[PDB]
UniProtKB/Swiss-Prot annotation:
Annotated residues for binding of Zn(2+) 7: C68, C71, H77, C84
Chain residues that bind Zn(2+) 8: C111, C114, C122, C124
Subcellular location: Host cytoplasm, Host perinuclear region; Host cytoplasm; Host endoplasmic reticulum
Signal peptide: none
Lineage top rank: taxon: Viruses
Protein name (record): Non-structural protein 10
Biological source species: Severe acute respiratory syndrome coronavirus 2
Residue ranges constituting the ExoN/MTase coactivator domain according to the UniProt record: 4-124
Protein purpose: Plays a pivotal role in viral transcription by stimulating both nsp14 3'-5' exoribonuclease and nsp16 2'-O-methyltransferase activities. Therefore plays an essential role in viral mRNAs cap methylation.
Subunit structure: Forms a dodecamer and interacts with nsp14 and nsp16; these interactions enhance nsp14 and nsp16 enzymatic activities.
Length: 124
């Protein structure tokens, strides 16, 4: 199976890093590991991205930058500001997806209404 530095290098130098990691995952590749898991009560709000850990009973909380493909690849973030929504914050990941937090944040979107991940916690 492939190791973290090899996966990250391959994606970092690709012209589309996100597509590289998604295509790697779809081929059965081993997810990036060593994301920073938090110890927390699991009685939090369940919001997706928060100032302190907010996992509910169905989620795990992680340090945000460790779960961000662009931070882990040390590359610019996609947007004219290059701003990262995860760095410095805590991200809640459904526990069924906690084996691949980088893939989860890459693939998913936060509901602008309820603040939870669309398709998972969001009940809108
Ligand atoms: Cl490696
Ligand atoms: Cl450990
Ligand atoms: Cl969720
Ligand atoms: Zn980032
Ligand atoms: Zn919602």
């Amino acid at each position: 199976t492939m190791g973290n530095s090899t996966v990250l290098s391959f994606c970092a130098f690709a012209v589309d890093a996100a597509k590289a990691y998604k295509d790697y995952l779809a081929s059965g590749g081993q997810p990036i590991t060593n994301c920073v898991k938090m110890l927390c009560t699991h009685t939090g709000t369940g919001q997706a991205i928060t100032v302190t850990p907010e996992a509910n009973m169905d989620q795990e909380s992680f340090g945000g930058a460790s779960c961000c493909l662009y931070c882990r690849c040390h590359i610019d973030h996609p947007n004219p500001k290059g701003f990262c929504d995860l760095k410095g914050k805590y991200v809640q990941i459904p526990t069924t997806c906690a084996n691949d937090p980088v893939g989860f944040t890459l693939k998913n979107t936060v509901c602008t209404v309820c603040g939870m991940w669309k398709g998972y916690g969001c009940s809108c």
